[PDB]
């Protein structure tokens with residue numbers, strides 16, 4: 001009840017602060033202004049919105065406020081566009097690291113700032129289409145009361161959101177990271193190579209923390225759908241899963257500060 005609201009507010013504040021610090025650090029320092037950091041600040045902007053908007057939206061869904069069907073769908077499905085945007089950003093970082101390690105010579109030619117920003121724009125406009133899919137159609141609406149179970153079809157969340165828009169990119173980026181580390185093993189000039197591995201491990205960890213926090217919620221949703229006969233998951237368990245999913249937005253500034261020395265130095269300069 002009140003504990004859920006307090007923890008959601010704390011998570012929102014921490015995520016907003018950390019990701020604003022990350023964006024300010026990237027913008028302030030020319031050394032950090034790489035291509036991978038463009039995807040990093042895209043994911044940081046996704047986390048910022050998760051903190052500013054998605055968490056209050058989840059609180060409102062918890063309170064069960066009444067509103068119009070379209071507004072209710074926007075409230076319920078806003079988190080999905082940000083989660084998909086984060087998926088696309090992590091996939092972009094994985095592909096960028098694969099290009100940087102497997103073919104370092106042609107990395108500059110293949111990977112350019114204009115291409116990076118274009119790819120970010122395409123990923124952000126595709127994520128909104130995927131996450132807001134229940135808004136246009138594929139809806140279970142029939143002032144409708146707001147419940148994520150009611151106004152959002154489980155099948156869209158259990159098939160389209162999870163098996164296709166989440167699991168497939170997650171498996172692709174898993175394969176990409178395993179290929180990255182296999183190529184790093186084959187390639188072993190030594191100081192430059194260990195920086196790429198240290199940079200690949202930094203990226204591989206935030207990608208893991210994402211799958212660690214978001215998949216519990218999706219597995220609970222699948223158990224709700226694939227086994228209707230079994231009792232619905234506990235409400236406290238549901239709130240805990242939501243809290244775990246929203247806590248992923250908080251973690252990765254800490255990972256950046258802990259692993260990357262440049263990020264820590266520019267954070268200290270800002271702080």
Ligand SMILES: Nc1nc(NCCc2ccc(O)cc2)nc2nc(-c3ccco3)nn12
Nearest residue numbers: 079148149157217218221232233235238242
């Ligand atoms: N299944 C589900 N439920 C909720 N909230 C409903 C909480 C609830 C659950 C059971 C009940 O009897 C009454 C209320 N939020 C949810 N968010 C998500 C989600 C976000 C991203 C992927 O799944 N799934 N999800």
